[PDB]
């Protein structure tokens, strides 16, 4: 596409500059261009890709939630019918969000996942696949809502199976995957008990593996562990 003429290393460089500048749409476009060069991504490059799109779709989600809440109140008993505008603009944001999710899912399917053989890349990408189907599910209503939910579940489950076989319990990717799959259970799949069980088991098994880590590996790990605890406190 429009990044086809730019060197891979230059795209990576500019993705890092965009991050520093909090220009996440640009970041995402640079990283999409880098993925489309066809080479596998390194560990640091995978993080650039995920950060970029997480921040883009995060903003879209926050806006969608604002508009959906306005829309719902606008459809209460005793609310003045204020016309089609709120629905229209919610739909506009929704379609843009879906477009970004489809773009990410397309990068993962062409051809990041199929070429990822090491656990740390394969689980990373399958977690992203679950995440972006989850974001599609957050806005889904039609005939394919259940299929979108199952697509998210299936990606998360494959990631979970690999992570438990191939990674230590304190691995940050394993921990973040469990965090998000637990949220998927609570918020998407109407399975709060599974969400709580997964978060607690994950936390406890990570606690018992901390003793093997250096001081630095004891960081993003206890960081994500605190998010698991935060969620458990919200949920119980």
């Amino acid at each position: 596409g429009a990044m086809g003429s730019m060197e891979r290393a230059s795209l990576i460089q500019k993705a890092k500059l965009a991050e520093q500048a909090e220009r996440y749409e640009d970041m995402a476009a640079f990283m999409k261009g880098a993925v489309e060069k066809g080479e596998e991504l390194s560990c640091e490059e995978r993080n650039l890709l995920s950060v970029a799109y997480k921040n883009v779709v995060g903003g879209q989600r926050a806006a969608w939630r604002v508009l959906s809440s306005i829309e719902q109140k606008s459809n209460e008993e005793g609310s003045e019918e204020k016309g089609p505008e709120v629905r229209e603009y919610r739909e506009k944001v929704e379609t843009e969000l879906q477009g970004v999710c489809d773009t990410v899912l397309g990068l993962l399917d062409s051809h990041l996942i199929k070429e990822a053989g090491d656990a740390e890349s394969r689980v990373f990408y399958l977690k992203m696949k679950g995440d972006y189907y989850r974001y599609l599910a957050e806005v889904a209503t039609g005939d394919d809502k259940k299929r979108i939910i199952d697509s998210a579940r299936s990606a998360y489950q494959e990631a979970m199976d690999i992570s438990k076989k191939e990674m230590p319990p304190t691995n940050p990717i394993r921990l973040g995957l469990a965090l998000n799959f637990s949220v998927f259970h609570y918020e998407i799949a109407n399975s709060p008990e599974e969400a709580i069980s997964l978060a607690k088991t994950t936390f406890d098994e990570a606690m018992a593996d901390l003793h093997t880590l250096s001081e630095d590996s004891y960081k993003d790990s206890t960081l994500i562990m605190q998010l698991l605890r935060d969620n458990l406190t919200l949920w119980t």
Binding site: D131, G176, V183, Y186, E187, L227, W235
Partner: peptide
């Protein structure tokens, strides 16, 4: 909302 990473 609950926390995700």
């Amino acid at each position: 909302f609950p926390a995700t990473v």
